[PDB]
Structures are given as structure tokens and as C-alpha cells.
Amino acid sequence: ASLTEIEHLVQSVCKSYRETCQLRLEDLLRQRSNIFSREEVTGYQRKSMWEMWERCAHHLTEAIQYVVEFAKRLSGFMELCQNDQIVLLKAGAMEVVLVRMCRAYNADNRTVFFEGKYGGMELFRALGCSELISSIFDFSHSLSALHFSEDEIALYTALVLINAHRPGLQEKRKVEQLQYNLELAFHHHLCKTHRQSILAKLPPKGKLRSLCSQHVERLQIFQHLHPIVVQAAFPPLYKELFSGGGEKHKILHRLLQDS
Ligand SMILES: CC(C)CCC(=O)N[C@H](Cc1ccc(NC(=O)CCc2ccc(Cl)cc2)cc1)C(=O)N1CCC(C)CC1
Numbered sequence: 001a002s003l004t005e006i007e008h009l010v011q012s013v014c015k016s017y018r019e020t021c022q023l024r025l026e027d028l029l030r031q032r033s034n035i036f037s038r039e040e041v042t043g044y045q046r047k048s049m050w051e052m053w054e055r056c057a058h059h060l061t062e063a064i065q066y067v068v069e070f071a072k073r074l075s076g077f078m079e080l081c082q083n084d085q086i087v088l089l090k091a092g093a094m095e096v097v098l099v100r101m102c103r104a105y106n107a108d109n110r111t112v113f114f115e116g117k118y119g120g121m122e123l124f125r126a127l128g129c130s131e132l133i134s135s136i137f138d139f140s141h142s143l144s145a146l147h148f149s150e151d152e153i154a155l156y157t158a159l160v161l162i163n164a165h166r167p168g169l170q171e172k173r174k175v176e177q178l179q180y181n182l183e184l185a186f187h188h189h190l191c192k193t194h195r196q197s198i199l200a201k202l203p204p205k206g207k208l209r210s211l212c213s214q215h216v217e218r219l220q221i222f223q224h225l226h227p228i229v230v231q232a233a234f235p236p237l238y239k240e241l242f243s244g245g246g247e248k249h250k251i252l253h254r255l256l257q258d259s
């Protein structure tokens with residue numbers, strides 16, 4: 001590529017992200033004052049473990065769907081073969097969500113936007129995975145210190161998804177070329193905005209990998225406790241990406257093929 005193409009890729013990636021960001025940043029900031037009362041927090045704690053899991057699985061699925069749409073709009077993604085598109089999404093969609101949610105996190109009071117209001121870790125105690133919850137909050141606390149702009153999140157999450165090292169890629173060279181151009185765009189934008197200092201503060205890939213593994217592991221614990229809840233009340237896309245043996249569903253293939 002050349003310089004004019006990279007500048008175009010920067011605006012292309014930032015545009016695809018704005019069209020699929022799920023929640024605009026200003027809308028998330030305007031809600032920061034709206035925090036669950038101590039009686040509303042106790043209500044969430046009084047909910048059953050199985051109800052909190054399906055409510056969280058529903059919100060995770062909604063977020064993942066926007067990441068799929070981000071991928072389809074992402075320059076060069078739909079040119080890859082379908083096997084590679086599915087490998088990249090299965091490996092990275094959750095990782096993109098884990099990065100995106102820092103916008104919905106308030107580092108001042110350590111709360112996240114959940115079901116119309118902001119609440120802390122104590123809101124999710126009924127899940128029975130306090131270690132995973134605190135790892136999630138800590139990860140959002142870390143990214144919040146970086147003070148990401150919307151353009152930086154756009155370019156970073158594009159690279160989280162377009163990773164030529166994902167096992168199972170049939171056209172590794174083709175993903176490499178797309179990843180190299182997206183790297184150039186991200187680094188060129190950081191250079192122009194004088195934000196190259198964030199490169200050393202970005203979390204290691206093994207951290208996002210550890211969070212996704214913690215999610216699958218705690219789901220397997222819950223699935224053992226309430227297998228019918230997962231089969232009957234969890235979204236099909238969620239089961240395809242996280243539940244064994246739930247990969248039998250093909251949701252993503254339909255999501256990608258349409259339009
Ligand atoms: C920029 C916007 C798109 C950000 C919008 C946004 O906030 N999305 C996330 C999605 C989400 C949902 C659930 C989790 N995990 C859990 O609840 C733990 C249980 C678990 C374990 C394993 C699996 Cl596989 C699935 C669930 C992680 C993330 C979100 O809604 N929240 C609110 C509550 C959680 C605790 C933090 C983040």
C-alpha cells in the first residue's frame with residue numbers, strides 16, 4: 001500500500017466502527033449519573049443464578065452481533081474465504097467485546113452500564129463467578145486509564161479481529177496482508193495524533209485470551225449445574241461460540257451470508 005491508501009483505510013475503519021458501535025459514546029456518558037439504588041442492587045443479588053446467566057448471555061450476544069456487523073463492514077474481511085471469516089470471528093468477537101465495553105465502564109465509581117443503569121461488581125454476585133467478574137472489571141479499569149478515543153478503539157479492535165495467527169486459517173498469507181495494512185493504519189493514526197505512547201500500555205494478547213478462557217470455563221461450570229437452561233434459554237449464537245458441544249448451530253454463516 002501507499003500513504004493515501006492508509007489514510008483512506010483509517011477513515012474506512014473508523015466509519016465501519018461508528019456504524020456498528022452499538023451505543024454511541026455520548027449516550028453512555030449521559031447515563032453515568034443513572035446508578036442502581038441499593039435496593040435495586042439487592043434485587044439483582046436476590047435473582048437466581050440461572051436467571052442472571054441468561055440475562056448476561058443475552059447482553060453478550062447483542063454485543064457480539066454488532067461485532068459481526070463490524071467485521072462484515074471491515075475493509076477486506078468479506079474478501080477472505082468463509083472458513084477464515086468464521087475462524088476469525090469465533091476467536092476474536094468476544095475479545096472485541098471485552099475491549100469495546102471499556103466505553104460502558106466508569107472508572108470513577110467502578111461501574112458498568114447494564115440494563116439501563118450503572119452498577120458495580122456487587123450487581124453480578126448471583127452468577128457465582130466472582131473471579132471472572134473482577135477480572136473483567138480490572139480489564140476495563142486498565143483500558144480506561146489509556147483514555148482511548150473512538151478512532152483508536154476502532155483501529156485497535158480491527159486488529160484484534162484481523163489476526164493472522166489464529167489457528168485454523170486456510171489463507172494465512174491473505175490475512176497477514178490485511179493485518180499488515182491495518183497495522184499501518186493504526187500506527188499511522190497514532191503517529192499523526194502523537195499517541196504512540198499507548199503502544200506499550202496496550203494489554204498483551206495473552207490477557208484477552210485468558211479472559212475468554214475464563215468465560216468458557218465458568219460457562220461449563222454453569223452448564224453442568226443447569227444444562228436445560230443453556231439448551232432452552234441461551235441465545236443460539238452464544239451457544240455456537242462458547243458452549244460445548246454447542247458448535248453444532250451455524251448462526252454466523254447466516255449472519256455473514258445475508259445482505
Ligand atoms: C461498547 C458496548 C458494546 C459495551 C456494552 C457492554 O457492556 N457489553 C458487555 C457484554 C458482556 C456481557 C457479559 C459478560 N460476562 C459476564 O456477564 C460473566 C458471565 C459470563 C461468563 C461466560 C460467558 Cl461466555 C458469558 C457470560 C461480559 C461482557 C456487557 O453487557 N457488560 C455488562 C455486564 C458484564 C459483567 C460486563 C459487561
Ligand code: NA
Pocket residue numbers: 102103104105106107143144
Ligand atoms: Na472508560
